[PDB]
Amino acid sequence: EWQENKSWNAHFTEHKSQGVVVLWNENKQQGFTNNLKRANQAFLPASTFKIPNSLIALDLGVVKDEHQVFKWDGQTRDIATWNRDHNLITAMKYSVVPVYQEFARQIGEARMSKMLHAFDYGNEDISGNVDSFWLDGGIRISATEQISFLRKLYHNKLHVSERSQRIVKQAMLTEANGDYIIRAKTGYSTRIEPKIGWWVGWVELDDNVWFFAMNMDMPTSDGLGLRQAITKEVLKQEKIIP
Numbered sequence: 001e002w003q004e005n006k007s008w009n010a011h012f013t014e015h016k017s018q019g020v021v022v023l024w025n026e027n028k029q030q031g032f033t034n035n036l037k038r039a040n041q042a043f044l045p046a047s048t049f050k051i052p053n054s055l056i057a058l059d060l061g062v063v064k065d066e067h068q069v070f071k072w073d074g075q076t077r078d079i080a081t082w083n084r085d086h087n088l089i090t091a092m093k094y095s096v097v098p099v100y101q102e103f104a105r106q107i108g109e110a111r112m113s114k115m116l117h118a119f120d121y122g123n124e125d126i127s128g129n130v131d132s133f134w135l136d137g138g139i140r141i142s143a144t145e146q147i148s149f150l151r152k153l154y155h156n157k158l159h160v161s162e163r164s165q166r167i168v169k170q171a172m173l174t175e176a177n178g179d180y181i182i183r184a185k186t187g188y189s190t191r192i193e194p195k196i197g198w199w200v201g202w203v204e205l206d207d208n209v210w211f212f213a214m215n216m217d218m219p220t221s222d223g224l225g226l227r228q229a230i231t232k233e234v235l236k237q238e239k240i241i242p
């Protein structure tokens with residue numbers, strides 16, 4: 001069911017980095033990873049949490065639809081793309097933390113906790129501040145657990161409406177061409193050691209879907225582009241994308 005391919009490690013070592021890629025072949029129900037241990041080690045989800053957060057906000061009516069505008073609060077922050085109005089689509093695209101912090105405050109501890117348990121999401125533990133627990137609280141999730149959660153979302157099997165799941169999958173759209181579609185979400189965890197980057201999602205092909213989840217050590221922001229670059233090299237090696 002699970003195969004370890006330590007040859008993908010070359011994609012990490014060649015960039016003086018360390019990390020794990022996990023792939024799941026939906027048709028064959030088989031998984032692949034370069035590091036079985038790290039594939040099951042639990043990290044802060046950071047901005048990958050915007051997937052479950054969006055689902056909960058939509059299903060409770062905190063977010064009406066993907067067009068609703070969340071006005072900039074007028075506080076200048078150091079990420080320029082955050083200093084503007086956003087909707088669900090652009091807030092996901094630019095990982096606009098302060099928009100999602102307000103979502104969480106309106107969701108509230110009790111409903112957030114129940115929903116993450118219903119999703120079987122990670123360790124389901126929201127201990128910490130309700131508006132930051134996915135950045136510096138007690139919640140943790142592994143790469144294999146990300147795959148399990150994403151598979152439910154793909155099949156509309158999460159315990160929220162089909163509409164909520166369709167909207168979030170639209171907002172996850174990252175890349176599309178004549179060969180594949182990628183729906184995914186990046187993450188960047190810096191407040192608790194070890195600092196890591198995430199990329200989780202899936203690749204839609206004509207006749208199959210490949211789910212993926214990767215994390216990697218991220219001592220500085222200089223390496224953030226390696227999250228996608230390393231993942232795609234693995235996909236290319238396995239002949240999933242040209």
Ligand SMILES: COC(=O)c1cccc(-c2cccc(C(=O)O)c2)c1
Pocket residue numbers: 047095186187188221224
């Ligand atoms: C080039 O990006 C930076 O330098 C930088 C610095 C500080 C923070 C972030 C950030 C914040 C949240 C999510 C992400 C991300 O990618 O998933 C990235 C980006």
Ligand SMILES: [Cl-]
Pocket residue numbers: 169170173
């Ligand atoms: Cl779409």
